[PDB]
Write a protein that binds this DNA or RNA. Structure first.
Ligand code: MG
Ligand code: MG
Ligand code: ZN
Length: 1434
RNA sequence: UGUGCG
């Protein structure tokens, strides 16, 4: 026991670093004799070792004296006001920059999370408090998961730690100086799956848990036999039938009447719409004049780069270099742009860049000519009168202005020459600075309109109509206006008729005319915009939100083709041949409206059309459907949209039209899903937060259980109330009471819960497939205090489970979101894994199972094929109404060694979740406080407002709400899925007991599809009363089991819907608008190739789901146009815009890139393909495999290709074929957005906990408080690509324009641009070694083509290496748009060659795209298939 | 840290 003591002492005395800081601790450590003080000094030394290593690694001065920040700043001579007690482990100063380096070690993930969050909040508080001291402070937190350091090596450190732990055990068994809590904490922090984590926590469950368990067992019988359960179900059904016939229970479903449903839809808003059958021509007339934007879109706005634009661009560029004062520089620049404009006007009588008496200066500013000249005169006079007081020289104001201009231009040229850009690349002409320059500016006068912005709605310059809805002119104008609105967000901050001297502006050209979007506010916020023109000013004025106008920016052709395909869906319908233009017009109008006025109310109105059309083609629908489909509408364009939708519906769903119902259903469903075109982002964050809190709070108030601000330790009143409400939840009566069943009230009946559990227990539901001391411990850098040690019924000793409430924004509103701590997330994950496995043991759940979803799809298709009855069910308020106590009771009453212990732990965790505390958002509390103050100081008084006001009048302010009646939306999702599965199995069993038929159910959390067998369908057709009684009994049973069938659920034989997938007979139902909108809305600020890959994935799934390939090619062209607007060069490896069906079905992304390259250089790819075929045959037998991956893939490129060609007996590519190249801006380093596979492996390996945990946690906490928009993402992408994003070989940062200018300097290199804008360069082989400045940025095209073709051949087969013969004009075929065809995709030694190819080819992610899900089913068009190319092995 | 309408 002392041999290891002497060994450890010798080890530390020999291998300790000889740092002056460690000397005192080493002297203390070695001199120790007693085991206790030896343990203390070993812990001391470890703490100092990690602290000092952290201080030195990050370059900071260690805090040995542990002085406060006050003492540090005062000792360094800087005074600060009083602050909180914060003592960092490390601190350093440089200039005015102060860095604190608080450090810690946590071997556990939950403890690490808690410590990092606490440390970050402490430093944030200190920084906010010191911001008054005018001193910078950037925090750095160094948290490591291990004790390893650079002062002590690994193995001796491990031996020291083990010996210290053994010494601790010895002292605790002998002296017991440490408290058992502190002893356990230190042992845990010294020793360095989740269900067994509850074994080490003390069981402190008192009588509260026993009372809860008794409550969930009281009145429940889970031992009923199948006979007794069947008799009880039969008695319940007979009583229900008798009461339903007598009218005591109201029927929740009605037989579908098409005319009645249409009439209900027509009178949906009959309080202000004083019409029902609107004329289509009058609707067009109203629509073209409804809004200022809509007026501008359909009006008659109709009518060589000049020097003003060149000078504006140059001076815009040189202002970011801060040549320097800001106001002075701005004024000087204004004068130069004015000179350029005057030069243009006197040269060719130009008129661009002017808005009457104001001109377009830098930073998107309108500048008044009068103000410019007065300011220039004042500034020149002031400088002249200042300077001439010294000497007597001719001032010559013109000369003074010229000299200032030359000085500014010289400084700007010097600044630009550093980054690699010369002035001649901006094409600026110095002739604009005439010798007569001052007088020329001061003797300049203009006459024109005065710019104005009308903020209020108190006449139109042009004729309000004339542009036809059929054409694409309206979409083009909307595209230009949307781009201008989005660009208005990029302006940097500078300092009724509202005509102004200076404001901000954006330019756009329409029909050869210049228009200016004028605004007076900067930022990504809603503001007033005014469209103005030089001829007549103030064309229109509106109040748009700029970050809601992204999807239309370059989508004119895409949207037009979307509408055209939708219209072609219904074109052979005979009754709609006369009313075919109107339909088209209506469709267009709806789209245009939702793209010009993107409103949440419009989004929900368009969404509800889906449920209307689903009920229209059904047999039975909920009686409350119509009330749910109606929304409050405020704006007049919303009522116009409703009228247009009503007209379209009444034309499509006319009684005279009965020809092709599947096509009309698809058309109306796509019109409904057009709601995805409107962005899903919140219009107002505070209003949506208020709505989310009301949705969270009203059900609890109706139930009657709301605990207001509960403590971590529960007061006896709160526990008593929780027990009472647990008893109340199971005290739901139904069908055997005077007042009858009360629908939609949360809770379950004891009788029906007993029936469910008994049926599960006896196997009725299964199938054949189943059967000093404390202070120093605190001072330690690795001692853990965040670990829970005991647990009660209310939760762990560390406190009850906290959940922050927020909203996840989506189409049709928001869904509630609960965010917990890491420890709470793991505790919940235990329950989730248990219930996921328990559901996996059974079948019918499609939530997480993927093959089960395919089984459900096949069953739905088979049901629809035979025209059997399908019941598509949504469950309303699945989250808020359903309760963790329900899950606890069900689990306690179910019957399936360690199983009893696992059930006990699960019950404890569910009891924890019962007592969870949800934190009211602080914005909501502040809004309620402001409303309360303004109401009490200065009539609706909503339920939530009444709640807050009642709490405010009695003192305490609500912060946390605890209630039995809530499960987190997505928190207990696997548990909810399991409950839905078992409850619906029991309900189907009861229905099969009652009738003769069976129901096949495929539940998934809240969504569900029930397929009725033949017997039930016959019952519906011949005995409607009994079928309706069965449906009502199903509704009643679901209500008794706390499953409230939504009013949007439908029973019918036409369509089966499940998880947003629709299936009918014969035809397919693609959500074309949904996929097109998803493609148009996903543009981020990632690296451009990543954006291309994401868009390619989206287009791949859209093609697989039935979108025609030409629309997808148009979407790809839209993405390339977005990239071209950022002026990013379009290399041949971004997107392919001439694809076909075979490219997406047979091929993959690599194959599409091969097709693009082969399109670019047809003749240079045949010989490469021949050599590749020879190579593939050589390596198929096994030879040439080992002498190719190491002799050629590592050698220099463009030189080994001829070696391969001569080695395989084929003609090597000629002189010119090697000259083809593409410009790679990431040749040295990836672009700044703020071997590839090797770095990917590194990042994945250093991600989870052992390495990179601190990095990933820092990025997560930085990106948590940073939320942006799609339009904000696009403007950020434009800013980043226009900035210095290109990294040179030596860590330098350059512009893309710098690289382009350096390329343009060399005359040998020539560019070649594709028909779609793809640029590839021909570099003469006479130069690849002389001037290596930018030749290093080029990559030969043939080598990348070879690598990609070889990798594609390995992953897909030899057919990709064959000759691509184009399609042969067979004859003439029908072009039926709804003529689909299903298709299946064509699916160790070569893995090494693949990974060797990927490290060699820095062009595309080849081997890493396997795991990032390949589509296993394609639905394409027969006409599109028969025009695809042929690629066969020969 | 953008000046870019395919
Ligand atoms: Mg410290
Ligand atoms: Mg559904
Ligand atoms: Zn001009």
């Amino acid at each position: 026991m002392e041999d290891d003591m002497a060994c450890v002492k010798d080890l530390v005395s020999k291998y300790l670093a000889d740092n002056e800081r460690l000397s005192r601790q080493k002297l203390a450590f070695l001199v120790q004799t007693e085991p206790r003080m030896l343990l203390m000094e070993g812990l001391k030394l470890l703490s100092l070792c990690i602290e000092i290593d952290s201080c030195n690694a990050n370059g900071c001065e260690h805090n040995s004296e542990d002085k406060s920040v006050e003492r540090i700043l005062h000792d360094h001579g800087i005074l600060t006001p009083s602050l909180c007690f914060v003592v960092p482990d490390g601190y350093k100063l440089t200039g005015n920059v102060l860095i604190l380096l608080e450090c810690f070690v946590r071997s556990s993930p939950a403890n690490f999370e808690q410590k990092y969050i606490e440390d970050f909040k402490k430093l944030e508080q200190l920084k906010e408090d010191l911001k008054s001291v005018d001193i910078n402070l950037i925090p750095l937190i160094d948290g490591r998961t291990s004790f390893y350091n650079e002062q002590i090596p690994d193995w001796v450190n491990d031996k020291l730690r083990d010996t210290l732990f053994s010494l601790l055990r010895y002292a605790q068994e002998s002296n017991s100086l440490f408290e058992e809590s502190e002893y356990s904490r230190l042992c845990e922090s010294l020793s360095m799956s989740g269900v067994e984590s509850l074994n080490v926590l003390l069981d402190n469950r008192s009588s509260h848990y026993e009372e809860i368990i008794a409550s969930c067992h009281q009145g429940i019988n889970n031992k009923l036999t199948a006979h007794e359960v069947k008799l009880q179900i039969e008695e319940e059904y007979q009583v229900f039938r008798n009461r339903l016939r007598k009218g005591e229970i109201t029927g929740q479903f009605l037989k579908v009447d098409k005319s009645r449903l249409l009439n209900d839809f027509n009178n949906l808003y009959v309080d202000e719409v004083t019409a029902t059958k609107d004329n289509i021509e009058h609707l067009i007339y109203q629509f073209k004049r409804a809004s200022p934007i809509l007026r501008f879109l359909y009006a008659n706005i109709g009518e060589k780069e000049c020097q003003m634009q060149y000078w504006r661009s140059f001076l815009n560029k040189v202002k970011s270099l801060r040549i320097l004062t800001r106001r002075k520089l701005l004024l000087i620049f204004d004068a130069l742009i004015l000179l350029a404009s005057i030069h243009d006007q006197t040269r060719h009588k130009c008129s661009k860049g002017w808005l009457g008496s104001c001109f377009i200066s830098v930073n998107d500013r309108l500048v008044s000519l009068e103000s410019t000249k007065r300011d220039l005169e004042k500034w020149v006079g002031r400088r002249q009168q200042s300077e001439r007081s010294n000497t007597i020289q001719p001032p010559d104001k013109n000369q003074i202005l010229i000299s200032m201009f030359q000085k500014t231009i010289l400084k700007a040229t010097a600044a630009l020459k550093d980054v690699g850009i010369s002035v001649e690349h901006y094409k600026i002409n110095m002739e604009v600075i005439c010798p007569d320059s001052y007088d020329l500016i001061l003797n300049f006068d203009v006459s024109g309109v005065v710019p104005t912005i009308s903020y209020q709605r108190t006449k139109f310059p042009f004729i309000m109509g004339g542009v036809e809805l059929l054409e694409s002119t309206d979409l083009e104008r909307l595209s230009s206006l949307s781009l201008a609105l989005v660009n208005s967000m990029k302006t940097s901050s500078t300092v009724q008729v509202v005509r102004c001297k200076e404001a901000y502006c954006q330019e756009f050209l329409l029909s050869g005319a210049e228009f200016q979007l004028i605004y007076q506010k900067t930022g990504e916020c809603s503001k007033c915009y005014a469209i103005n023109d030089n001829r007549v000013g103030e064309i229109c004025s509106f109040y748009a939100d700029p970050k809601r106008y992204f999807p239309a920016i370059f989508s004119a052709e895409v949207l037009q083709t979307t509408v055209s395909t939708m219209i072609s869906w219904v074109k052979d319908c005979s009754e709609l041949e006369e009313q075919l233009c109107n339909i088209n017009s209506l469709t267009k109008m709806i789209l245009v409206l939702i793209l010009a006025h993107p409103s949440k109310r419009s989004q929900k109105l368009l969404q509800n059309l889906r449920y209307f059309i689903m009920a229209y083609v059904s047999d039975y629908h909920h009686k409350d459907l119509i009330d749910k489909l109606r929304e409050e509408l405020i704006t007049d364009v919303e009522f116009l949209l409703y009228r247009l939708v009503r007209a379209l519906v009444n034309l499509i769903l006319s009684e005279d039209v009965k020809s092709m119902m599947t096509n009309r259903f698809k058309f109306i469903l796509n019109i409904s899903y057009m709601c995805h075109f409107i962005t899903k982002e919140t219009p107002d964050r505070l209003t949506d937060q208020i709505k989310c809190f009301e949705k969270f709070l009203e059900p609890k108030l109706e139930f009657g259980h709301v605990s207001i601000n509960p403590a971590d330790v529960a007061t006896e009143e709160e526990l008593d109330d929780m027990v009472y409400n647990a008893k109340k939840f199971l005290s739901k009566e139904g069908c055997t009471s005077i007042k009858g069943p009360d629908y939609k009230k949360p809770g379950v009946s004891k009788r029906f819960l007993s029936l469910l559990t008994s049926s599960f227990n006896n196997g009725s539901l299964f199938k054949e497939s189943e059967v000093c001391t404390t202070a120093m411990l605190k001072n330690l850098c690795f001692y853990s205090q965040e670990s829970p040690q005991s647990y009660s019924s209310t939760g762990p000793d560390t406190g009850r489970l906290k959940f922050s409430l927020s909203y996840k924004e989506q189409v049709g509103g928001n869904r509630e979101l609960y965010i917990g701590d890491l420890r709470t997330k793991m505790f919940t994950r235990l329950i989730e894994d248990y219930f996921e496995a328990l559901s996996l043991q059974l079948s019918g759940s499609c939530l997480n199972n993927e093959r089960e979803f395919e089984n459900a799809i096949l069953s739905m298709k088979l049901n629809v094929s035979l025209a059997h009855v399908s019941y598509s069910m949504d469950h309303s308020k699945w989250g808020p109404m359903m309760c963790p106590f329900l899950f606890l009771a069900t689990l306690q009453n179910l019957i399936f060694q360690a199983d009893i212990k696992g059930r006990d732990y699960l019950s404890t965790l569910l009891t924890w979740h019962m007592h969870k505390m949800v934190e009211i958002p602080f914005n909501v509390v502040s809004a309620m406080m402001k409303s309360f103050i303004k109401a009490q100081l200065g009539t609706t008084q909503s339920i939530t407002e009444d709640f807050f006001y009642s709490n405010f009048q009695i003192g305490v302010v609500p912060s946390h709400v605890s209630s039995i009646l809530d499960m987190g939306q997505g928190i207990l999702h696997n548990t909810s899925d399991f409950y839905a599965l078992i409850s619906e199995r029991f309900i189907n069993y009861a229905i099969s007991c009652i009738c003769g038929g069976t129901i096949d159910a495929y539940t998934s959390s809240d969504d569900q599809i029930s397929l009725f067998d033949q017997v039930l369908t016959e019952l519906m057709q011949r005995d409607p009363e009994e079928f309706k009684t069965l449906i009502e009994f199903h509704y009643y049973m679901s209500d008794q089991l706390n499953k409230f069938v939504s009013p949007k659920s439908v029973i019918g034989r036409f369509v089966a819907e499940f998880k947003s997938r629709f299936y009918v007979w014969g035809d397919e139902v693609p959500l074309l608008t949904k996929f097109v909108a998803a493609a148009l809305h996903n543009i981020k600020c990632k690296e451009p190739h990543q954006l291309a890959e994401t868009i390619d994935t989206i287009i791949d799934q859209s093609v697989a789901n039935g979108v025609p390939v030409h629309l997808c090619n148009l979407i790809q062209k839209r993405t390339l146009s977005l990239l071209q607007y950022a002026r990013y060069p379009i290399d041949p490896f971004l997107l392919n815009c001439e694809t076909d069906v075979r490219d997406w079905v047979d091929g993959n992304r690599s194959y599409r890139i091969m097709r693009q390259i082969e399109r670019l250089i047809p003749d240079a790819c045949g010989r490469i393909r021949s050599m590749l075929r020879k190579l593939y045959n050589k390596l198929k037998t096994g030879q040439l495999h080992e002498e190719f991956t190491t002799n050629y893939l590592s050698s220099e490129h463009l030189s080994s290709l001829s070696n391969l060609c001569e080695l395989l007996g084929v003609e090597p590519p000629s002189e010119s074929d090697l000259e083809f190249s593409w410009l790679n801006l990431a040749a040295h380093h990836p672009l700044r957005m703020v071997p590839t596979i090797v770095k990917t492996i590194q990042n994945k390996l250093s991600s989870t906990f052992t390495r990179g945990a601190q990095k990933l946690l820092s990025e997560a906490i930085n990106k948590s408080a940073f939320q942006s928009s799609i339009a904000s993402g696009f403007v950020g992408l434009c800013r980043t690509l226009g900035s210095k994003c290109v990294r040179g070989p030596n860590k330098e940062s350059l512009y893309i324009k710098s690289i382009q200018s350096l390329i343009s300097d060399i005359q040998g290199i020539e560019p070649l641009i594709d028909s779609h804008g793809v640029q590839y360069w021909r570099v003469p082989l006479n130069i690849r070694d002389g001037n290596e400045g930018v030749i290093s940025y080029f990559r030969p095209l043939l080598w990348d083509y070879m690598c990609i073709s070889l990798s594609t051949a390995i992953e897909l087969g030899a057919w990709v290496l064959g000759e691509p013969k184009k399609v042969r004009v067979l004859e003439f075929f029908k072009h039926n748009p709804c003529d689909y065809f299903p298709l299946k995709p064509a699916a160790i030694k070569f893995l090494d060659l693949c990974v060797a190819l990927d490290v060699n080819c820095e062009a595309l992610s080849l081997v890493s795209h396997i795991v990032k899900k390949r589509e296993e089913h394609y639905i394409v068009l027969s006409s599109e298939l028969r025009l695809s190319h042929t690629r066969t092995h020969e």
